[PDB]
Specification:
innate immunity; alpha/beta; Rossmann fold; monomer; two-stranded antiparallel sheet; six-stranded mixed β-sheet; 8 strands
Length: about 240
């Protein structure tokens, strides 16, 4: 399985004929798009999430195939995750970028994602709203009017989209324990459909795979959709 590339002519054709419907794409040269992967595997009061190492390498290989430079932050606290996100939102390469990806994977609760020192009595949680506050058009200007794809896995803001999986830790991993079900299905659909589908359409393909009578409960959800146009990643261009 590999990331199928979109033909150059279709990338040029779709850019001309559907320019007003799709997000703009910067040229390969002079392009410095960035991506950030935050993943907590070791905890003090939570079960170990070892096996997400394959989700890190999988997402990192996929984003690199999408011409993204991936920064990996691992086993951080709630405050350290806050500081890493704002440092990412202020990097100058976003000015020469067209989009960004934020992949956050750890244990979680409804209001946010847990950190390495989370306890049910002393919670250490990064709230989901903090992520949008950091990258909104007010506090992040180099990514204004640009797609800000957020992919979360747990247990005015514009141009946002969030693919969220809250599958509990017991039933969230593949039978091999070599990666999670959600990430593996996400990578598979990106490798098979990035070249002919826009981003939100790819997220729907991932959801359709969870449309079995057994997997419907673990179905990922698209939340806080603030995007104003379609995002074709045009893999290979």
């Amino acid at each position: 399985d590999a990331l199928k590339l979109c033909p150059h002519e279709e990338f040029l054709r779709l850019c001309k004929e559907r320019a007003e419907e799709i997000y703009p794409i910067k040229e390969r040269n002079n392009r410095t798009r960035l991506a950030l992967i935050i993943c907590n595997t070791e905890f003090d009061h939570l079960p170990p999430r070892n096996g997400a190492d394959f989700d890190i390498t999988g997402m990192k290989e996929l984003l690199e195939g999408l011409d993204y430079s991936v920064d990996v932050e691992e086993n951080l606290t709630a405050r350290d995750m806050e500081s890493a996100l704002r440092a990412f939102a202020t990097r100058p390469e976003h000015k020469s970028s067209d989009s960004t990806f934020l992949v956050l994977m750890s244990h979680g609760i409804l209001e946010g994602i847990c950190g390495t020192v989370h306890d049910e009595k002393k919670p250490d949680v990064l709230l989901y709203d903090t992520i949008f506050q950091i990258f909104n058009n007010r506090n992040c200007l180099s990514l204004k009017d640009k797609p800000k794809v957020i992919i979360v896995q747990a247990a005015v803001e514009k141009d946002f989209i969030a693919f969220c999986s809250s599958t509990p830790h017991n039933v969230s991993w593949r039978d091999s324990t070599m990666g999670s079900i959600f990430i593996t299905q996400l990578i598979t659909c990106f490798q098979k459909y990035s070249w002919c589908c826009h981003l939100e359409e790819v997220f729907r393909k991932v959801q359709q795979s969870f449309e079995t009578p057994r997997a419907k409960a673990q179905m990922p959800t698209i939340e806080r959709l603030s995007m104003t146009r379609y995002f074709y990643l045009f893999p290979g261009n």
